[PDB]
Amino acid sequence: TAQSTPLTSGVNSQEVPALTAVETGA
Amino acid sequence: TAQSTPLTSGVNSQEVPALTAVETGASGQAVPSDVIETRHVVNYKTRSESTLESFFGRSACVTILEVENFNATTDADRKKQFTTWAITYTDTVQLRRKLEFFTYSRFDLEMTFVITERYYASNTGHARNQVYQLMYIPPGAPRPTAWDDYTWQSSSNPSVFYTYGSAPPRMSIPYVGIANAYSHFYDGFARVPLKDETVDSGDTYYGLVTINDFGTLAVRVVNEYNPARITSKIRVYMKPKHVRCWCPRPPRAVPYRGEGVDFKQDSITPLTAVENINTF
Amino acid sequence: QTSVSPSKVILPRGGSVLVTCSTSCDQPKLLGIETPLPKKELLLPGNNRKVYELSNVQEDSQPMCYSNCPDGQSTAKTFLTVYWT
Amino acid sequence: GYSDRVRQITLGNSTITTQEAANAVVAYGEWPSYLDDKEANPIDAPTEPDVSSNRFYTLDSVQWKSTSRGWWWKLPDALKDMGMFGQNMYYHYLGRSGYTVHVQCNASKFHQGALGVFAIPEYVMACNTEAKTSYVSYVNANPGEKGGVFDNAYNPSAEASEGRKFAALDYLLGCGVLAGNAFVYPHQIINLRTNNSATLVLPYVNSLAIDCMAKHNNWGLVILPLCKLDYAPNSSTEIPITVTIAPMFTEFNGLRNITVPATQ
Amino acid sequence: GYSDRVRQITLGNSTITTQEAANAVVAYGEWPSYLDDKEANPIDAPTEPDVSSNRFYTLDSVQWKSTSRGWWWKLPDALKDMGMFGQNMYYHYLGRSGYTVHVQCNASKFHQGALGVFAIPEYVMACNTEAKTSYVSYVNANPGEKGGVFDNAYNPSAEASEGRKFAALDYLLGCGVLAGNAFVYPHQIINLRTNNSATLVLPYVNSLAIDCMAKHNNWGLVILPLCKLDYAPNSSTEIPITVTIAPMFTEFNGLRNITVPATQ
Amino acid sequence: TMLGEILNYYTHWTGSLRFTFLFCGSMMATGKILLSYSPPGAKPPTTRKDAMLGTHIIWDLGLQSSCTMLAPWISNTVYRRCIKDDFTEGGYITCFYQTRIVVPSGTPTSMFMLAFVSACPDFSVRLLRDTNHIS
């Protein structure tokens, strides 16, 4: 199948996945 | 099987099954063993034909399509060379009425194409045997402008090529609905007309017809022009199989007048008036 | 795709302008005329052909008539002038 | 000790008691519930207005005369301006809701009459013009609180202006099916010698898992007078039908600014 | 790997990220929570607007000039017209709420300035008249979204008409205590060489367990310019201070019709 | 776009989208930029007090020079269509200056920004068809 969606809630921490850098090629 | 009938005899007691109350919403519940005396009848009769897989187990007719094949000169003669039909089940009144028993349905659809021909004129020569293209155009693929444009080559659209004189072409189309069931009746619009629009969408159509795009069946004659004008007729069929249905409804009584649930004024009287109430 | 038959309209200030906008399709999913001018409807049988009855024309306007045929959004306008003494 | 005629229903901070009731109809044998995780269509965080909108809302009381022919309400849109359910609705793109429709009409023991209280999934009605088909405006199809009435005559207006409304014909039930076949829906009959309240419990019924409440009207509440009201001293009396509806198990998705539909 | 300067805060369907932050102040060392059953004042069923009002709301951006003297917001009433928290508020008699105040102001590395961001429990201010005492109107004490400004001059109007407002004096902080002592409150200082965002986490602080939000304003948000803005090419530049506030762990009681206060 | 060309071979699509925004200004240019996604069925957002109410993200400028605004799958149907359809309309997307972008002296004032598009790992298509780019 395609990926499901996990039950997550809000965060407040230093782990920041919203910020990437497309200079790296990924 | 259906239910048998138990050997019961007469009663005289406070247990009264003959009296119900239909204000509560439930229907009647008295089987004939309650109110009279019955024998024992072993019932071997089953309800096998009345099930939905056999109630819809016929290849009904949904439309009649006409294409021709001749030396087209004017522009109206070039639009007789092909025919594009929007796919729907509402262009007849008998498979529609069997499907408007139910609000929602889910079925894999099986189509078969029964195709006839004739000569138009009498002394304009003859013609060779013919091959017919039937191309399923999903919503978004370009509909054909002329009968021999770039669109008929069908690099990804499903096409069938029926040689005339063979057995009629058959194919199975799966459940292609974007909902979890086909909404036979949709009580809502396609958009929300907002406050103080300069758009003025005061001509948005009601209900069902603003959500259904199932495709376009475009049919050409693959031959070039013969000396004799060959007029064809094509009868697109549907047969719902693997049928499930939900939320039953009363069947259509008065005739239709469109693709909606509308009804024409001169046929709002389906009953015939009896002589009096006491007429057997 | 979308046709407006009264394309060139001359009419004085304040009067009514009959605008006939239809489409070249059989199922107009979403069709309408975009203007801030008062209009009820005009009666016209047929699921395709259509007339809006505009009124109180004061300045020069160019209303846009969209039509949601299954091949994208279409565009047709009309040109109307006013008169003054 | 207990009886089928006395019933208290409480949701949120609202209570209906009734002392001459018939039994309650759970529609199609299913009590309404939240959207399970194995069927969820959107992936945003759902708003569950737990007690702020799962409560009884009392509509306007229409008067049932001897010449009254019927009434209709579209159910997720008759509550469009009711408390916080009307504020949970237009601030969200998706919405599912179960319902507890309770219809209130009572008279003396000398009156008589019958009221077929229905609840019709996808109550698609016919337009009141023969110029075009499937042709109803937004304001005329969604009156909201006040609802609409039926009529015992089909007069299609030749104007396409005044024909953009429901041709609410009573014996064809709007959609051209006979009214004597409407008992295949979840229904109760208010009979003025037996009961005085009709209670239905309506789950969320739609092909989708969750859908726009602003576009799509799920249920159709229908009240038909089967046998007309007849009070022998005063033949032209009026007893009121009051409709009290509660949303149940609501769930919303896609938060944004407020949706304000057109009013004309 | 991780640093104290990068922080993402998510509540409901709203997110604040910041890449030059200082550390966050939990006010008086307590994270906000719901009312426990061992302390409950009302006995009705509490409405918990779980995600519909526990989200970030962005106020209006005031401009911090070189002559700007201060700003003030009353915290449960600056959100009086914000989404559903402004609809949970006026449909209920009781209300408690924790808060996440996030104050946003950024400049280049060539600017300079300081912003004392405060959060004052029971921020009772002084009236701007000497005719009467404790004498402020309702509209002048509760501006809502736009807030108010301080002033470096105390001019009490002899009119009792135009004196029904806060005598917002900056060095006396409104209430006649010196501004250099205001650091006993939960505070952060936006310094334009070190940080660009001030994040506070404010629990529900009141003597009661739960109280009317329409009457009583719990917290007072205060932004004082300690060192004025000074940009050397353009001495009269303006950098905006934007205040983004989220309610947290809200709980309401006593449902009724809507409260609409006076506007004049 | 590369996503848009594959979708014009199919008809029905589901899944969430990924908008990664590259800021190509100077080093000293600092700023904050609001990135918003509003689900459809209301007023299209024009001012900042209309797009804050949707699904948004406040992005800061600095060392990590690429944000990611995600447009989630919020839809009535399981499958939106690959045409301009009213019933399967997607959503309204805007982008506002959060505070503003500040440049010092000796630094360009008018700058630029690049905008990407991709698909989340729950994105899938159906119903192959022809395209409408080539003839």
XYZ file of C-alpha atoms in Angstrom, chain D residues 26-246:
221
model
C -32.512 4.059 15.349
C -32.117 4.563 11.607
C -30.983 1.379 9.820
C -30.039 -0.179 13.159
C -26.851 1.842 13.703
C -26.117 4.339 16.448
C -23.909 7.224 15.251
C -20.209 7.176 16.036
C -17.004 9.038 15.313
C -14.927 8.373 12.208
C -12.704 5.377 12.848
C -9.016 5.486 11.942
C -9.396 2.675 9.399
C -11.704 4.852 7.266
C -10.359 8.396 7.646
C -10.285 10.543 4.533
C -8.408 13.717 5.697
C -5.149 13.716 7.624
C -5.487 16.951 9.580
C -6.261 17.130 13.282
C -10.029 16.745 13.779
C -11.993 19.154 15.940
C -14.435 17.342 18.236
C -16.824 19.898 19.768
C -17.671 17.562 22.598
C -20.576 19.280 24.363
C -20.679 22.670 22.682
C -22.599 21.372 19.676
C -23.907 17.914 20.612
C -27.055 19.338 22.164
C -30.694 19.887 21.293
C -31.599 22.879 19.150
C -35.229 23.994 18.919
C -36.344 25.264 15.511
C -39.337 27.459 14.717
C -42.800 26.073 15.373
C -44.836 25.765 12.199
C -48.610 25.687 12.561
C -50.426 22.588 11.316
C -53.821 23.743 10.060
C -56.511 21.624 8.441
C -55.187 22.699 5.020
C -51.492 22.242 5.818
C -49.941 19.945 3.246
C -46.431 19.140 4.474
C -43.057 20.423 5.573
C -39.442 19.740 4.699
C -36.082 20.525 6.282
C -32.610 19.733 5.005
C -30.929 18.435 8.096
C -27.231 19.535 8.219
C -28.304 22.955 6.949
C -31.357 23.639 9.086
C -28.819 23.903 11.921
C -26.596 26.341 10.006
C -27.202 29.212 12.428
C -27.647 27.341 15.713
C -25.175 28.072 18.473
C -21.705 26.656 17.979
C -22.688 23.966 15.480
C -23.267 26.848 13.095
C -19.803 28.068 14.047
C -18.155 24.658 13.874
C -19.671 24.263 10.411
C -18.498 27.301 8.491
C -15.009 27.342 9.987
C -14.351 23.840 8.663
C -14.195 22.216 5.246
C -15.287 18.756 6.324
C -17.987 17.632 8.674
C -19.858 14.521 9.700
C -22.654 14.425 12.247
C -25.169 12.036 13.683
C -28.577 13.371 14.601
C -31.407 12.958 17.107
C -34.515 14.397 15.485
C -37.372 14.913 17.940
C -40.646 16.239 16.488
C -43.121 17.711 18.973
C -46.862 18.009 18.308
C -49.640 17.453 20.823
C -53.376 17.974 21.064
C -56.280 16.944 23.263
C -58.017 13.584 23.260
C -60.771 15.051 21.068
C -58.542 15.973 18.112
C -57.426 13.595 15.377
C -54.707 13.480 12.772
C -51.583 11.755 11.579
C -48.092 13.050 10.844
C -45.678 10.945 8.866
C -42.286 12.031 10.200
C -39.612 10.850 7.769
C -35.838 11.080 7.435
C -34.713 10.677 3.840
C -31.064 10.093 2.840
C -30.082 12.345 -0.089
C -33.449 14.064 -0.365
C -32.985 15.387 -3.892
C -36.042 17.370 -4.977
C -37.329 18.604 -8.316
C -37.089 22.107 -9.735
C -40.180 24.258 -10.286
C -39.474 25.094 -13.924
C -39.585 23.230 -17.223
C -37.091 25.472 -18.984
C -34.065 23.661 -17.526
C -33.358 20.510 -15.515
C -31.647 20.027 -12.124
C -32.062 23.746 -11.759
C -32.448 25.180 -8.242
C -30.677 28.188 -6.715
C -28.772 28.102 -3.438
C -31.008 30.297 -1.297
C -34.188 28.554 -2.441
C -32.680 25.112 -1.794
C -31.255 25.974 1.640
C -33.716 28.018 3.703
C -32.156 26.932 6.986
C -34.219 27.358 10.157
C -37.641 28.056 8.668
C -37.629 25.148 6.226
C -40.179 24.871 3.457
C -43.700 23.659 2.804
C -45.197 21.191 0.367
C -48.071 21.906 -1.999
C -50.964 19.953 -3.488
C -50.519 21.479 -6.949
C -47.676 21.507 -9.471
C -47.536 24.932 -11.144
C -44.226 25.252 -13.026
C -43.472 28.919 -13.556
C -42.469 29.751 -17.119
C -39.993 32.263 -15.700
C -36.524 30.858 -15.168
C -36.263 33.470 -12.400
C -39.023 32.237 -10.094
C -38.554 28.615 -11.164
C -35.226 28.100 -9.373
C -36.893 26.476 -6.369
C -38.169 23.126 -5.182
C -41.394 21.949 -6.823
C -42.515 20.606 -3.464
C -45.422 18.421 -4.546
C -46.828 16.406 -1.672
C -48.092 13.179 -3.239
C -44.975 12.869 -5.384
C -42.899 13.763 -2.289
C -40.833 16.237 -4.332
C -38.787 13.656 -6.216
C -41.587 11.983 -8.137
C -42.003 8.854 -6.033
C -45.379 8.135 -4.472
C -45.793 9.187 -0.851
C -47.332 5.854 0.135
C -43.981 4.207 -0.534
C -42.029 6.589 1.713
C -42.228 4.141 4.624
C -39.069 2.412 3.367
C -37.221 5.300 5.010
C -36.695 5.522 8.777
C -40.054 6.919 9.822
C -42.451 7.403 12.684
C -46.093 8.419 12.599
C -47.363 10.916 15.144
C -50.954 9.826 15.764
C -52.880 12.217 17.998
C -54.682 9.424 19.826
C -51.570 7.334 20.521
C -48.509 9.561 20.812
C -47.323 13.159 20.801
C -43.612 12.957 19.910
C -41.544 11.306 17.187
C -37.919 10.498 18.022
C -35.444 9.339 15.395
C -31.728 8.659 15.772
C -29.910 9.342 12.531
C -26.321 8.195 11.882
C -24.044 9.892 9.395
C -25.084 8.465 6.026
C -22.979 9.401 3.007
C -20.858 7.600 0.431
C -17.813 9.546 1.564
C -16.295 9.206 4.999
C -16.644 12.935 5.669
C -17.966 15.681 3.434
C -18.583 19.415 3.201
C -21.678 20.369 5.167
C -21.885 23.700 3.342
C -22.262 22.007 -0.054
C -23.899 18.674 0.689
C -27.139 18.118 2.612
C -27.181 14.583 3.971
C -30.659 13.951 5.368
C -34.073 15.292 4.553
C -36.610 15.719 7.333
C -40.160 15.348 5.973
C -43.446 15.762 7.861
C -46.540 14.748 5.860
C -50.070 15.097 7.215
C -51.538 11.731 6.302
C -54.931 12.338 7.916
C -55.731 16.021 8.264
C -56.373 17.759 11.573
C -60.050 17.802 12.498
C -61.357 19.381 15.707
C -65.141 19.257 15.797
C -66.068 22.566 17.584
C -63.406 24.691 15.878
C -62.687 23.208 12.459
C -59.964 25.793 11.738
C -57.810 25.321 14.826
C -54.010 25.262 14.781
C -51.770 22.962 16.786
C -48.029 23.674 16.526
C -45.385 21.273 15.294
C -42.060 22.119 16.928
C -38.933 20.368 15.664
C -36.036 19.863 18.078
C -32.826 18.471 16.577
C -29.493 17.603 18.156
